[PDB]
Design a binder for this molecule. Structure first.
Ligand SMILES: Nc1ncnc2c1ncn2[C@@H]1O[C@H](COP(=O)(O)OP(=O)(O)OP(=O)(O)O)[C@@H](O)[C@H]1O
Ligand SMILES: Clc1cc2[nH]cc(Cc3nnn[nH]3)c2cc1Br
Ligand SMILES: Clc1cc2[nH]cc(Cc3nnn[nH]3)c2cc1Br
Length: 327
């Protein structure tokens, strides 16, 4: 069957920590007082929660309340434990409190409020310097959570909040995040379609932190080339075809061969044969101001089929693309 794989960094972080760190099921939630929070307005509703802007009336500060849906109790405890483990980490959203909602009778996560700039506005206006600056800020968050034995698994534009005024970034929505345990087989039905790593698309379950680096590469490609999303699949199958049209089918088949993966036969009639396109093929007069040889070399090293061959977050932070960013 498939050949096993393990992360090339932070492999045994969870083995060397007490069981309390990663055994989220045995975690006892410390409950705050729901009366401290007054809901102001509904911000949205996803598949697992309803999100509200609120005020913490004990300090008159703005907060965000995520009222969880009454499903998957283990999922709730996993997110809480991950948020708690990462609290205070660079560019990680701060979990301020956990309260029992009086209406839903489910847990409600209270986060620090980020006065975030519109996502469309962010994509349309970031300069070359700001893409490098913000990419470096995302890498601080990823290296931290990976160093803490956690993979985010849902890295995408909507989960990266930027307060462009204070040049502040926060990585949010840790509801799909997981503890990395070498040898563990994970659910491939994670991340959003356009940001899914080839490991997910070919149904390779023994993946690791490097899935987040593929997602980050998809963001980078969309930002530097002004193509939202960069890999625009009609569904999860066409998603791999879109990748193959850029990276080529030869390296895809080498990746499937190496890990001894049984590719879904439905790909036989749609993958075709494609050669890698040189990154300069995607450069045009409307995006040339965001492209440099350093941007292309950095992107090239993130968007690789073989998850073991991608730059880790720390290696990515050493890249020449970031030499111009003030540190
Ligand atoms: N800490 C926070 N500070 C400010 N706004 C937040 C915070 N956490 C979440 N939000 C905002 O609350 C809303 C949550 O609603 P929702 O999850 O449905 O939107 P979304 O970003 O389109 O999600 P997705 O695209 O992942 O499905 C979003 O507009 C999000 O930007
Ligand atoms: C993460 C995500 C999850 N999504 C669903 C469940 C549990 C479940 N099984 N059947 N219905 N609900 C779950 C657990 C964790 Br950890
Ligand atoms: C860092 C965080 C970001 N949150 C949203 C965007 C916009 C976008 N669209 N496609 N990829 N990114 C964004 C850009 C940077 Br750099």
């Amino acid at each position: 069957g498939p050949v096993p794989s393990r992360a090339r960094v932070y492999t045994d972080v969870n083995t060397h920590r007490p069981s309390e760190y990663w055994d989220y099921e045995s975690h006892v939630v410390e409950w705050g007082n729901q009366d401290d929070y007054q809901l102001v307005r509904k911000l949205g509703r996803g598949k697992y929660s309803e999100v509200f802007e609120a005020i913490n009336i004990t300090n008159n500060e703005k907060v965000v309340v995520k009222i969880l849906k009454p499903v998957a109790a283990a999922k709730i405890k996993r997110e809480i434990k991950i948020l708690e483990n990462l609290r205070g980490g660079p560019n990680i959203i701060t979990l301020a409190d956990i309260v029992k909602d009086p209406v839903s009778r489910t847990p409600a996560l209270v986060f620090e409020h980020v006065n975030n700039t519109d996502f469309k506005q962010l994509y349309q206006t970031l300069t070359d310097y700001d893409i490098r600056f913000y990419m470096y800020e995302i890498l601080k968050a990823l290296d931290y959570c990976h160093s803490m034995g956690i993979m985010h698994r849902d890295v995408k534009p909507h989960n990266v909040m930027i307060d462009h005024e204070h040049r502040k970034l926060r990585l949010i929505d840790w509801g799909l995040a997981e503890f990395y345990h070498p040898g563990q087989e994970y659910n491939v039905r994670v991340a959003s379609r356009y940001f899914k790593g080839p490991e997910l698309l070919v149904d390779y379950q023994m993946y690791d932190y490097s899935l987040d680096m593929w997602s980050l590469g998809c963001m980078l490609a969309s930002m530097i080339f002004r193509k939202e999303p960069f890999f625009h699949g009609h569904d999860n199958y066409d998603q791999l075809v879109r990748i193959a049209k850029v990276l080529g089918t030869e390296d895809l088949y080498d990746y499937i061969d190496k890990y001894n993966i049984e590719l879904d036969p439905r790909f036989n009639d749609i993958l075709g044969r494609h050669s890698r396109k040189r990154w300069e093929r995607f450069v045009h007069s409307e995006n040339q101001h965001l492209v440099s040889p350093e941007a292309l070399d950095f992107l090239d090293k993130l968007l690789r089929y073989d998850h073991q061959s991608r730059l880790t977050a720390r290696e990515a932070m050493e890249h020449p693309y970031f030499y111009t960013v003030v540190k």
